[PDB]
Design a protein around this motif. Structure first.
Motif, PDB file in Angstrom:
ATOM      1  N   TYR A 127       0.794  -1.221   0.000  1.00  0.00           N
ATOM      2  CA  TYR A 127       0.000   0.000   0.000  1.00  0.00           C
ATOM      3  C   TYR A 127       0.830   1.277   0.000  1.00  0.00           C
ATOM      4  O   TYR A 127       1.734   1.453   0.815  1.00  0.00           O
ATOM      5  N   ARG A 128       0.516   2.160  -0.939  1.00  0.00           N
ATOM      6  CA  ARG A 128       1.049   3.512  -0.932  1.00  0.00           C
ATOM      7  C   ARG A 128      -0.101   4.451  -0.619  1.00  0.00           C
ATOM      8  O   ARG A 128      -0.886   4.803  -1.501  1.00  0.00           O
ATOM      9  N   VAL A 129      -0.209   4.849   0.641  1.00  0.00           N
ATOM     10  CA  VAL A 129      -1.334   5.663   1.071  1.00  0.00           C
ATOM     11  C   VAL A 129      -0.964   7.142   1.150  1.00  0.00           C
ATOM     12  O   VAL A 129       0.141   7.506   1.560  1.00  0.00           O
ATOM     13  N   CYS A 156     -16.607  10.474   1.964  1.00  0.00           N
ATOM     14  CA  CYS A 156     -15.733  11.076   0.948  1.00  0.00           C
ATOM     15  C   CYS A 156     -15.513   9.670   0.380  1.00  0.00           C
ATOM     16  O   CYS A 156     -14.693   8.907   0.895  1.00  0.00           O
ATOM     17  N   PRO A 201     -15.865   5.601  -1.475  1.00  0.00           N
ATOM     18  CA  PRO A 201     -16.122   4.171  -1.292  1.00  0.00           C
ATOM     19  C   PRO A 201     -15.978   2.970  -0.364  1.00  0.00           C
ATOM     20  O   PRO A 201     -16.960   2.293  -0.072  1.00  0.00           O
ATOM     21  N   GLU A 202     -14.760   2.726   0.105  1.00  0.00           N
ATOM     22  CA  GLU A 202     -14.494   1.614   1.008  1.00  0.00           C
ATOM     23  C   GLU A 202     -13.804   0.528   0.196  1.00  0.00           C
ATOM     24  O   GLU A 202     -14.465  -0.349  -0.356  1.00  0.00           O
ATOM     25  N   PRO A 203     -12.464   0.577   0.141  1.00  0.00           N
ATOM     26  CA  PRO A 203     -11.555  -0.489  -0.293  1.00  0.00           C
ATOM     27  C   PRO A 203     -11.802  -1.786   0.489  1.00  0.00           C
ATOM     28  O   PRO A 203     -12.749  -1.840   1.274  1.00  0.00           O
ATOM     29  N   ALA A 240     -12.020  -3.769   3.423  1.00  0.00           N
ATOM     30  CA  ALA A 240     -12.116  -3.309   4.810  1.00  0.00           C
ATOM     31  C   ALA A 240     -11.000  -3.838   5.713  1.00  0.00           C
ATOM     32  O   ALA A 240     -10.743  -3.304   6.803  1.00  0.00           O
ATOM     33  N   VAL A 258      -7.895  -3.762   4.909  1.00  0.00           N
ATOM     34  CA  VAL A 258      -6.813  -2.798   4.790  1.00  0.00           C
ATOM     35  C   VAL A 258      -7.119  -1.532   5.584  1.00  0.00           C
ATOM     36  O   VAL A 258      -6.205  -0.806   5.966  1.00  0.00           O
ATOM     37  N   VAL A 259      -8.392  -1.256   5.849  1.00  0.00           N
ATOM     38  CA  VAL A 259      -8.665  -0.183   6.800  1.00  0.00           C
ATOM     39  C   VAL A 259      -8.395  -0.631   8.235  1.00  0.00           C
ATOM     40  O   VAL A 259      -7.590  -0.011   8.925  1.00  0.00           O
ATOM     41  N   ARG A 260      -9.020  -1.718   8.686  1.00  0.00           N
ATOM     42  CA  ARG A 260      -8.706  -2.214  10.032  1.00  0.00           C
ATOM     43  C   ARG A 260      -7.301  -2.818  10.062  1.00  0.00           C
ATOM     44  O   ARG A 260      -7.132  -4.012  10.304  1.00  0.00           O
ATOM     45  N   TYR A 273      -4.505  -0.130   9.076  1.00  0.00           N
ATOM     46  CA  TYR A 273      -3.769   1.123   8.989  1.00  0.00           C
ATOM     47  C   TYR A 273      -4.156   2.024  10.154  1.00  0.00           C
ATOM     48  O   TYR A 273      -3.441   2.966  10.493  1.00  0.00           O
ATOM     49  N   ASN A 274      -5.298   1.721  10.763  1.00  0.00           N
ATOM     50  CA  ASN A 274      -5.819   2.510  11.871  1.00  0.00           C
ATOM     51  C   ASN A 274      -5.390   1.970  13.228  1.00  0.00           C
ATOM     52  O   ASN A 274      -5.161   2.739  14.162  1.00  0.00           O
TER      53      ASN A 274
END
Lengths: 79, 79
Positions: free
Chosen positions: B18-20, B30, B32-34, B36, B38-40, B42-43
């Motif tokens: 990932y290149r964030v 703001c 869509p939602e890749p 999920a 990958v969100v739970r 990076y946080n």
């Protein structure tokens, strides 16, 4: 290529509010550099978490922390 | 309104890279939602930090962590 978000505010008078959006879309960054204190504040591993809010569907985790001498807050998506 | 970035990769076969990029630019998100997961990831407050790399000017902190059953990595700007 897509997107999520989170928010970032501080306590004490002179507080800043932040509505941050993160885009998961070799050389060079991707722009400028806001006040660097707001970067060294959203990145800092606030290992402590004492909040779970939102309405899910969407789930945010709330987490207070002191850096240097300013108390923040930081609510991030957590599925 | 401006921007910073960070990177996010995983270990084990079937790894994602990932290149964030984060943009600090009332109703609605703001986009869509890749995936999920990958969100739970990076946080999650990786309170442990065992790396400090880059070339400063720019300074990144490196931090490994296991979520569920997949080891990640996460290097974030830290002035």
């Amino acid at each position: 290529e897509a997107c999520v978000t989170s928010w970032l505010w501080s306590e004490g008078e002179g507080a800043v509010f932040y509505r941050v959006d993160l885009h998961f879309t070799m050389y060079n960054p991707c722009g400028p550099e806001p006040p660097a204190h707001v970067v060294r504040a959203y990145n800092q591993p606030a290992g402590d978490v004492r909040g779970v809010w939102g309405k899910g569907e969407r789930t945010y985790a709330e987490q207070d922390f002191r850096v240097g001498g300013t108390r923040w807050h930081r609510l991030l998506r957590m599925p």
